[PDB]
Amino acid sequence: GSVIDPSELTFVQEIGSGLVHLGYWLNKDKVAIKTIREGAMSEEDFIEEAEVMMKLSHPKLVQLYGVCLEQAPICLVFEFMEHGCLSDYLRTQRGLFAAETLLGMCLDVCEGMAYLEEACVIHRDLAARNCLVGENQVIKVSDFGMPVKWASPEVFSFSRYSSKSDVWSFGVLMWEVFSEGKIPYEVVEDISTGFRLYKPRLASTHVYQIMNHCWKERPEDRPAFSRLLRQLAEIAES
Numbered sequence: 001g002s003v004i005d006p007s008e009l010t011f012v013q014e015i016g017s018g019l020v021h022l023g024y025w026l027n028k029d030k031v032a033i034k035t036i037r038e039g040a041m042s043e044e045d046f047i048e049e050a051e052v053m054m055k056l057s058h059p060k061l062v063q064l065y066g067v068c069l070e071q072a073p074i075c076l077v078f079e080f081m082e083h084g085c086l087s088d089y090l091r092t093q094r095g096l097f098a099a100e101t102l103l104g105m106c107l108d109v110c111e112g113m114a115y116l117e118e119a120c121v122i123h124r125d126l127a128a129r130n131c132l133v134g135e136n137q138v139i140k141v142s143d144f145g146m147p148v149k150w151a152s153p154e155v156f157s158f159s160r161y162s163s164k165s166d167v168w169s170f171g172v173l174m175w176e177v178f179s180e181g182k183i184p185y186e187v188v189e190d191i192s193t194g195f196r197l198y199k200p201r202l203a204s205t206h207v208y209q210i211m212n213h214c215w216k217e218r219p220e221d222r223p224a225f226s227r228l229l230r231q232l233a234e235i236a237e238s
């Protein structure tokens with residue numbers, strides 16, 4: 001449920017393009033209001049996505065205040081994340097990141113993903129653009145209630161979605177983080193021969209090794225998010 005009346009929302013500024021607006025709920029809480037795009041996706045699927053997210057509680061997954069149903073265009077009322085999407089934040093702050101901070105960002109995403117994996121929730125669109133940056137550079141996974149660059153071989157050829165296909169996307173997300181927001185890469189068939197993604201300068205041999213483990217051809221050969229989490233934590237300690 002969590003239905004919010006339109007009169008309770010104050011629209012301040014468009015911050016993303018459906019559209020994302022910086023706003024206020026009850027003239028108190030700073031919120032990110034996501035208004036539906038009239039063309040893409042139905043009103044019903046947009047609300048169902050929010051209903052799924054409101055029942056998934058983890059410190060590394062974005063939270064919602066509620067939904068605005070009354071009039072078109074309908075909107076989702078999210079908590080406001082101070083530094084916006086991860087993809088943009090990595091590019092704007094490029095050259096100012098230490099390798100330890102970039103690994104910490106990957107650990108944050110992996111934590112949220114391990115929770116979703118255990119809850120049997122498949123993201124389907126895991127990328128740096130679908131992750132948010134809050135205070136103290138904390139990363140939260142967004143749009144988890146629902147390309148080829150982030151798609152695994154079984155996804156771009158047979159549409160076989162699983163937590164192991166999300167693991168492949170996480171490997172590409174890891175590349176985006178360590179390359180500081182670089183755009184990855186008929187991208188399918190290029191990956192079929194053996195073309196991965198070049199090793200980023202800030203990523204160590206041990207970090208790139210984990211990325212390759214996410215990029216195994218067979219989904220059963222890729223490690224689960226629960227295993228990846230402890231593998232990433234081992235590198236940070238040593």
Ligand SMILES: CCC(O)(CC)c1ccc2cc(-c3[nH]nc4cc(C(F)F)sc34)[nH]c2c1
Pocket residue numbers: 015016020022032034062078079080081082083084085132142143
């Ligand atoms: C980069 C900082 C800023 O330019 C400040 C206005 C910015 C830009 C875009 C966003 C998007 C958010 C945001 N917070 N929470 C959500 C949820 C979103 C999704 F679920 F629609 S986008 C978003 N904060 C921002 C902050």
